[PDB]
Design a protein around this ligand. Sequence first.
Ligand SMILES: [Zn+2]
Ligand SMILES: [Zn+2]
Lengths: 46, 173
Amino acid sequence: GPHMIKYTIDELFQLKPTLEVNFDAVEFRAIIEKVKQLQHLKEEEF
Amino acid sequence: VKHPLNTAWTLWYTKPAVDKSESWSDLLRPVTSFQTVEEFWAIIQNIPEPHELPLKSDYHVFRNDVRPEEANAKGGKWSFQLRGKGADIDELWLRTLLAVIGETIDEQINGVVLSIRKGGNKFALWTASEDKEPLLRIGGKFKQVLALTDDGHLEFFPHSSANGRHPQPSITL
Ligand SMILES: [Zn+2]
Ligand SMILES: [Zn+2]
């Protein structure tokens, strides 16, 4: 039959805490920053 | 100490194309998966906030057995246009994610998408539901999560409208 676990928003915030992740967070940020660099160079602001 | 979530979820990122040719590649990539509250917060702490993302970025947070994609699939999306709430995008996004992974928005909810676009950012809550009765309850709860007291920011688009160039919502709240 059914199965469920529910947490309220407040409950989840109360469980919020360097925190380890399982992906390369440095590379992920670097990719996004490189995109912003290229968008800035290519958009004509003036 | 672990607080398990009802299901596992995957965060996906859609990277903006910087060259025309990149539109021929798969720019939608899975970032990481999580299945506890602690794992969720570790991810949030280690990824850029919505307001920092380049134009044409998307974040997708979907149940593990759901890729973020037919027109003839069942259900649709509740689309939230930030408009005048745009300064609060990071907190509204986080609250939406908590409502989803904590299963309090839901009766089902497949995933949620953040879209960064010129002129205006939006979120989309993807549901398999069709009947207006559950969709109105979902949309009303979503509206409460977002602390919206005016009408017009929420539009429900059935999956069928995806085929269109000018899709039209069947519910607006
Ligand atoms: Zn400049
Ligand atoms: Zn912040």
